[PDB]
Design a binder for these strands. Sequence first.
RNA 1: AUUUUUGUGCCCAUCGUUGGCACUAUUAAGGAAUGGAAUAUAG
DNA 2: GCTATATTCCATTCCTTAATAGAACTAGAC
DNA 3: GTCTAGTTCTATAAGGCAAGGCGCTG
Length: 1077
Amino acid sequence: NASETRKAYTTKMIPRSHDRMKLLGNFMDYLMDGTPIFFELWNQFGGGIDRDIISGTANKDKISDDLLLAVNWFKVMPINSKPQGVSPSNLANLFQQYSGSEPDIQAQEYFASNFDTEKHQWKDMRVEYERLLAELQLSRSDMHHDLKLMYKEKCIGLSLSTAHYITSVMFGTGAKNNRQTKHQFYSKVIQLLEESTQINSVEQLASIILKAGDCDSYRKLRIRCSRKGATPSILKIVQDYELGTNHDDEVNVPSLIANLKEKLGRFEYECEWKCMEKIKAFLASKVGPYYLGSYSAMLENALSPIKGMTTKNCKFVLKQIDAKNDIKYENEPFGKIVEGFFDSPYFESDTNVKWVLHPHHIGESNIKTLWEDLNAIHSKYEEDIASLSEDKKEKRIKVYQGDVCQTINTYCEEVGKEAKTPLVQLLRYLYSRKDDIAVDKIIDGITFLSKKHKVEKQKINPVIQKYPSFNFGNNSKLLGKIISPKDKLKHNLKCNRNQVDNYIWIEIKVLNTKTMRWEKHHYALSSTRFLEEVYYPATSENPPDALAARFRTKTNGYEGKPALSAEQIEQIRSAPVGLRKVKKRQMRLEAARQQNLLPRYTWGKDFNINICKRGNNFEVTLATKVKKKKEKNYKVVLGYAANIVRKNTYAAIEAHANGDGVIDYNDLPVKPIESGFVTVESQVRDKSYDQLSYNGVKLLYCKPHVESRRSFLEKYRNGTMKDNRGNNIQIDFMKDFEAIADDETSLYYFNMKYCKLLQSSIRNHSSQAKEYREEIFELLRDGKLSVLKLSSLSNLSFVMFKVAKSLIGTYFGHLLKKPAPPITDEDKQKADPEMFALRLALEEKRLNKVKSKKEVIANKIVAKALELRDKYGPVLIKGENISDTTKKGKKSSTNSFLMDWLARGVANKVKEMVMMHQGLEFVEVNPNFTSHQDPFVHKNPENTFRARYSRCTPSELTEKNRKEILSFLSDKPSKRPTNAYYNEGAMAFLATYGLKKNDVLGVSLEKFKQIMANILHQRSEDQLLFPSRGGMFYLATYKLDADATSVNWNGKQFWVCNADLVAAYNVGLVDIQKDFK
RNA sequence: AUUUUUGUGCCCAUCGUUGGCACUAUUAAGGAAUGGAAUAUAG
DNA sequence: GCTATATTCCATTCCTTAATAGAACTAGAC
DNA sequence: GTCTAGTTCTATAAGGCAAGGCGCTG
């Protein structure tokens, strides 16, 4: 029920004397250079593992003694690594030779794993182990003795101990406790418990431990049996009894005996090493004298990839075995028939090169409907010619042959509308062998080919060394500390300096590479965020209390916007533009402390100092653990719906509600509390712009720029295109340009759209790429209305960045060609560095735009939950669980559109953020039917689904809308469950407006519009509702949307609400019962 | 231990009135997608 | 009606999963 | 009295498929 997370603060290193920063850098260089030594050594230790080393263990979970050995003996690593490479063919032979037996299925699957042949190769770690023995002159029996002890101590194997512990037991020369003493003592405790198994009091239990230890006190007991180290749980019982905090605690004799029996194995030996002195000597030669902190720090970096990749690879092998078990090899013959397409005459290749077949190549399970249509044509064609005795009807069948093509051609094109277009030739070939293979078998065969290729291509994880980071702290690490604010105050008072500053100091014990001795030194850091939320001190007496959350942030209740003195204001106006932003923040900081507005921050040695040295740059990070206690007594449920182009929404439901609006949900009283859209507003001149929806200024205020763009297009407005045998069409892009140049259009849409048109222009003028160069810089870079200068967090702004990157791609590709060595970033940078920089600037800008959107959306969701929690109580935030949206069976455009969703990225941020607050919990839920369920009716107790609707005026009606509505009236059946809702909803539209299909069907759009206008005018309404997939509105039984208007739909009264607001309620209601007893 | 000029970023035809905001860091691989140039296909 | 399938070669993005960011202690050194 | 620099510590159920959850713009 205890949760732990870390909050990190990045900082800037504020340098000191070159010589002072040189000493720190030299130390950092020392740990980094040494780290690869431990990695090579531990890999070698892994090679020494054998059956006599892992005989009778827990072997983690669902693992095989063989797999544990194979992962240690053989690893996939870079080709240029020191360990000798081995061919995958010899893996089984080497395993048998070392093992003395053949490898099992798990070991075999491991060897079978895919990897990049060009970048990595298998390495024989066993051979590396021999190198250690030969190089260090070690007895095989002696190293084996040490290896066995290391395994018991968790220095090697599946579950590893901390680097600090491993270094201490392996290389420590400090006084160690006597294991024999603990072993007799633990056995005696077990013995008395067996002798008196019915005790049910801690008091009886504490007496037994003391009897076992032959002592009257825990202190005396600890001195004899566990002289040094943390207190064991058994002794902890005696201790807590003396302080009387465990008197009423439940006693379980079997468990105490069982836990004690498990810990017995570790005390059968005294840890007397035989090769540690030699090994320490080799290490000393390569990394210098043994120190616990330095050796431990290097080992931690070395051990992480070795231990982590072993865990990941074992899970991977087990998953792969299961995936292979899932494949139906019994369907392999059917796959052969389907795969026979390449050898048929329906597929033609110059080099006869085939490719993998997937379900989307036949339209997945739709081929079943198509087969039926084909059979009806065939059965009708048989009867026709059976009762068409007259000969010379070759055309009858020839006509039937043509009908088959059109049936397939229609099928492919129809499936192609909402998905990838299936292959006509493949389908024609399959119909030829219709007698040969059943249709269901075809799907099964095509699925087997696709599934087997996917599982077979999965790659193993290579073992790659880490780029090291070193940690300084109060305990179990390199000694380090952040000077405390009180210490800071004292320091400045003793130096006769101003009481407060904006710099942070740390004192860390560092090694002098020259003297090879430890020294403590001070280093200065700078991090306004750390100062504001932690470090700056509340000097005033009677300062506000520390917040429930430690950090002093706006979300935590500290507004931090105090009245500024005129002297402070001058400093901001006075400061250079580069420093104005930081100074204003500091001035407010000094203002809130001066005005006693700064809340206190409780200080503890809770901050870790992480230092990373890249070149001469030092990256110091301060991170602290944040503890939280789970609270499962939720009173409010906050649902979150995530959208790509529309606004995200949230809805809160009160639980165990009693009041005017209470609804009884399956015996649970709930009250919809509120719903809303997630928007991030930024103020400008008493004007606020939502960062998630702003699409840019209208063109009329951008007339020079739009006209400036027009002048360039005019020079290259001559573009040729060929469609439907339309070669040398002499297409004009400027016509298309004006369509987007309307003053009513948003700038971002214009800029994104202009990029595409420019993209097409370059395609026509392939040898005139160079000319667009300067226009691109003004469009994306230098221009005042350039993409880099103005952009929002809206979906359209992101697409604009997408098109801009593609456009640069086109300019580079066209810039180089035949009139073959391949173009690389090196060539493009050489050919055009400025443009190359522009691509990087756009990439870096988009990544910073994406990080922000995730953080700002996360804060709004967390802020609402915190607001609801204070008024009502513990809140459970629920978000849709979105996964596997990008698939190869979907159109690339659909996949490209889906990539910008960011739902998982936002949820991970919310999930991480929720961990810092008590009374807040986050879980993901199934999003199935969340857009079509009538909230608070559906599942109370009946199933209630309704279609999404669009609203517009008769002039706004489009042919697409007209077609959509009719399709819904089709009697053709569908696998999509939601299809029923649209047909049912489409029925209401005819019923509600007194129409008949004949009026909608076979009617010009214009005439259809007139019909709809005459009805609306009679009813005194200007807008009409129609069911549209992805519709903006939902007819809800309840008034979930505050701006909803009641309407009578087909004899029923519903509230027209934003569909997204409805969805947020639906998300909250998914498995709502499980959340409450 | 004193640097006094900066933690990282986000928004805007008006870049400031004290403009308005937000935020866990790192390592490494893997999975699934995308862009551009082109080739082969069937229209 | 932006033709679609597939492939090659150069680049990208969004996300997941293995890790790091130790706790409690005391003999002996200030 | 504190603090450092080393040691040892741990604590031990629920559907199958696959659609659903997303947007366009002329």
